[PDB]
Amino acid sequence: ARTVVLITGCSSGIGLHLAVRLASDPSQSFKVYATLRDLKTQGRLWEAARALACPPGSLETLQLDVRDSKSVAAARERVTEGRVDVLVCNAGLGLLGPLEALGEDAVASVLDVNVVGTVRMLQAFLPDMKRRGSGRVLVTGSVGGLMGLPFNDVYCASKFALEGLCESLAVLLLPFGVHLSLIECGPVHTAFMEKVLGSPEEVLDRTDIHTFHRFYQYLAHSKQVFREAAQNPEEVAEVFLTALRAPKPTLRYFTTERFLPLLRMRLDDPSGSNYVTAMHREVFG
Amino acid sequence: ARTVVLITGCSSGIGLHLAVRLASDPSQSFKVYATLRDLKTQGRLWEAARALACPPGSLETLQLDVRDSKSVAAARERVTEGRVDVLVCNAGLGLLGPLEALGEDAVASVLDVNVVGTVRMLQAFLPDMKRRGSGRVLVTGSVGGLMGLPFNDVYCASKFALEGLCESLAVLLLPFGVHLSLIECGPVHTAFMEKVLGSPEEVLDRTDIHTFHRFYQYLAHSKQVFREAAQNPEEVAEVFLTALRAPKPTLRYFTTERFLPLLRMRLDDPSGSNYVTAMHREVFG
Numbered sequence: 001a002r003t004v005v006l007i008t009g010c011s012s013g014i015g016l017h018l019a020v021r022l023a024s025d026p027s028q029s030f031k032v033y034a035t036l037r038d039l040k041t042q043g044r045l046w047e048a049a050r051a052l053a054c055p056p057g058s059l060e061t062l063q064l065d066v067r068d069s070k071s072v073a074a075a076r077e078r079v080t081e082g083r084v085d086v087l088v089c090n091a092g093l094g095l096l097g098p099l100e101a102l103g104e105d106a107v108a109s110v111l112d113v114n115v116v117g118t119v120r121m122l123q124a125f126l127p128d129m130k131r132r133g134s135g136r137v138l139v140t141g142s143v144g145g146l147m148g149l150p151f152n153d154v155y156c157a158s159k160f161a162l163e164g165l166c167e168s169l170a171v172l173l174l175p176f177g178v179h180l181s182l183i184e185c186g187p188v189h190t191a192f193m194e195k196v197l198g199s200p201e202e203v204l205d206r207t208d209i210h211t212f213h214r215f216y217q218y219l220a221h222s223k224q225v226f227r228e229a230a231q232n233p234e235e236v237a238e239v240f241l242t243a244l245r246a247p248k249p250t251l252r253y254f255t256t257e258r259f260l261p262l263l264r265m266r267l268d269d270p271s272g273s274n275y276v277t278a279m280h281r282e283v284f285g
Numbered sequence: 286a287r288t289v290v291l292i293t294g295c296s297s298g299i300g301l302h303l304a305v306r307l308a309s310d311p312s313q314s315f316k317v318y319a320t321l322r323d324l325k326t327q328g329r330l331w332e333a334a335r336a337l338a339c340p341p342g343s344l345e346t347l348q349l350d351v352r353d354s355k356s357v358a359a360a361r362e363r364v365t366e367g368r369v370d371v372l373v374c375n376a377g378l379g380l381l382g383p384l385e386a387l388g389e390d391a392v393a394s395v396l397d398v399n400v401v402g403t404v405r406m407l408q409a410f411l412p413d414m415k416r417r418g419s420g421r422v423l424v425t426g427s428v429g430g431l432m433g434l435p436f437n438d439v440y441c442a443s444k445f446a447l448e449g450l451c452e453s454l455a456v457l458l459l460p461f462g463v464h465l466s467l468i469e470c471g472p473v474h475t476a477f478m479e480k481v482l483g484s485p486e487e488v489l490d491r492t493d494i495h496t497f498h499r500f501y502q503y504l505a506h507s508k509q510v511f512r513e514a515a516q517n518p519e520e521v522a523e524v525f526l527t528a529l530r531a532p533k534p535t536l537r538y539f540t541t542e543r544f545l546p547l548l549r550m551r552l553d554d555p556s557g558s559n560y561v562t563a564m565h566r567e568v569f570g
């Protein structure tokens with residue numbers, strides 16, 4: 001159908017549920033290109049798509065690895081319509097542990113995927129939206145890009161980076177009639193975390209005993225935050241559709257109002273210490 | 286002298302003036318290791334140091350390239366005292382132009398220096414401060430890390446990343462008695478900008494005519510913002526000393542109160558659109 005939507009990172013979580021929520025839409029107005037780093041993992045996407053009854057042709061899958069600009073351009077070339085009306089930059093990776101225990105590859109990967117990957121997506125797809133004078137870009141955001149979290153130093157570094165990247169682009173884009181919005185998400189049940197790490201044996205080798213202990217405490221605490229605040233990817237998908245529907249989309253959309261008070265205490269105390277003291281008390285006690 | 290201070294990026298600007306402001310301090314309590322990417326450029330540092338009368342031994346220069354962990358560890362090994370009381374992460378690069386005109390090397394460099402470089406500094410020097418139960422880390426910040434600026438997409442991406450990185454570390458660090466603060470700076474007369482770019486011929490080749498035109502407009506506008514708001518590096522150095530003096534340093538220190546209203550409109554309108562509309566009007570008219 002008429003609105004062409006291209007989504008990154010659709011093998012699971014937000015991306016997967018958003019592709020099927022769009023392709024199974026009552027109005028049948030979306031033509032979805034669900035992109036995945038590795039096409040062989042598309043099984044779960046179709047199982048969900050078939051549970052929602054997506055009309056043949058409403059959903060097509062492509063291989064798109066955000067670390068490779070040749071993969072990104074190849075995917076763009078497979079959009080048969082020759083246009084993308086809604087570009088959703090969703091692919092992302094986590095990175096957890098003491099800063100000193102993180103290796104150079106892991107740090108570099110996180111920045112390459114979460115930041116440079118988005119830049120690649122935007123360089124390949126913004127030109128044509130500017131030429132056409134229209135387009136929507138939706139970026140999966142995180143409360144981790146709005147407030148720092150202990151033992152997520154590089155991950156927060158990467159999520160804050162998208163905030164800077166998208167805000168800077170948004171200031172330029174108004175006059176071109178291209179809208180950019182971030183969908184700010186808290187914890188989401190998606191297996192994002194399941195790969196965020198483990199291996200206490202190796203970690204203890206890379207840091208001191210006190211840091212290690214504080215790490216275990218952070219891990220106990222995020223086990224409760226996840227049970228307390230994870231949302232399901234279906235709920236998050238609805239926030240994207242809210243954004244793609246608005247005639248004049250705002251820069252930010254929040255999927256929960258839950259972390260706002262905490263967010264407000266970084267501003268109402270500009271020195272930023274109130275936040276630091278409050279987050280240390282919530283995490284470590 | 287007694288407080289050992291190690292500073293990155295001292296061939297010019299903030300780093301240069303901060304090293305000499307500390308080594309020429311009346312109390313003569315600072316022993317400064319002024320680090321530079323390339324030792325052969327140390328001329329300007331000494332000229333200023335000799336204009337301020339720094340006692341022999343108050344200032345030592347080392348080579349330290351933040352993109353190389355071997356250079357970073359080698360520099361740490363030359364601290365004869367075996368300790369660093371104040372670590373100042375100042376090295377940084379700019380990147381300007383239409384997002385689509387930026388090459389992969391340039392983007393990668395900016396992130397490698399501004400973000401990963403700080404991570405390298407922190408991995409090499411935090412362990413010993415945690416072991417000792419004391420230390421101050423001061424990071425040169427930017428209003429560009431707090432609000433997005435058109436045509437500085439990757440630069441803002443990198444400066445926001447430091448915000449995330451330092452806030453996340455700050456939450457962990459309290460209990461270790463190690464303080465981390467960011468020194469938020471606006472435009473500074475330092476030649477940072479002088480290398481931020483030019484070459485309209487090559488740029489026009491990489492983007493569309495409308496974007497190009499908007500770029501020229503941004504360039505006219507930053508010529509006035511720089512004359513209107515640049516501060517001198519001596520003024521910025523005093524803010525670092527304010528931070529290193531406080532018995533309980535806050536996470537953020539601002540060198541000007543000038544951009545706060547703008548900063549406040551990103552929060553008081555959480556959708557973040559008020560800011561986007563206001564920044565577009567200030568830059569493009």
Ligand SMILES: NC(=O)c1ccc[n+]([C@@H]2O[C@H](COP(=O)([O-])OP(=O)(O)OC[C@H]3O[C@@H](n4cnc5c(N)ncnc54)[C@H](OP(=O)(O)O)[C@@H]3O)[C@@H](O)[C@H]2O)c1
Nearest residue numbers: 009011012013014037065066090091092142187188190192
């Ligand atoms: N999960 C949370 O609690 C949470 C909270 C806030 C924000 N977010 C954000 O939500 C987004 C979606 O993640 P999720 O929570 O749904 O986790 P997820 O279930 O692990 O899904 C992330 C997707 O990104 C893909 N991806 C990873 N590397 C890629 C690459 N190089 N090229 C293309 N795609 C790649 C993954 O594919 P593969 O499976 O093949 O690797 C997967 O399809 C991320 O940007 C993110 O960080 C998540």
Ligand SMILES: NC(=O)c1ccc[n+]([C@@H]2O[C@H](COP(=O)([O-])OP(=O)(O)OC[C@H]3O[C@@H](n4cnc5c(N)ncnc54)[C@H](OP(=O)(O)O)[C@@H]3O)[C@@H](O)[C@H]2O)c1
Nearest residue numbers: 294296297298299322350351375376377427472473475477
């Ligand atoms: N200038 C502004 O208007 C402004 C505004 C806000 C924030 N800041 C920030 O202020 C900091 C200091 O910059 P500045 O304004 O003083 O500009 P600058 O005069 O160009 O000084 C930056 C210094 O960083 C060094 N550097 C660059 N790459 C390095 C590397 N790979 N390893 C070690 N050192 C390296 C440069 O050395 P080389 O000369 O050899 O390259 C130079 O000594 C930066 O983090 C920054 O982005 C500046």
Ligand SMILES: C[C@]12CC[C@@H]3c4ccc(O)cc4CC[C@H]3[C@@H]1CC[C@@H]2O
Nearest residue numbers: 142143144149185186187222225282
């Ligand atoms: C930033 C994340 C969402 C917000 C989460 C949060 C939010 C508030 C809080 O007090 C603790 C945590 C712990 C884990 C955080 C997450 C780590 C991954 C995710 O992106």
Ligand SMILES: C[C@]12CC[C@@H]3c4ccc(O)cc4CC[C@H]3[C@@H]1CC[C@@H]2O
Nearest residue numbers: 427428429434470471472507510567
């Ligand atoms: C972010 C910077 C400081 C703040 C500057 C600013 C701040 C406010 C504003 O309205 C325009 C500009 C243009 C250039 C910006 C700068 C680019 C380099 C510097 O780091």
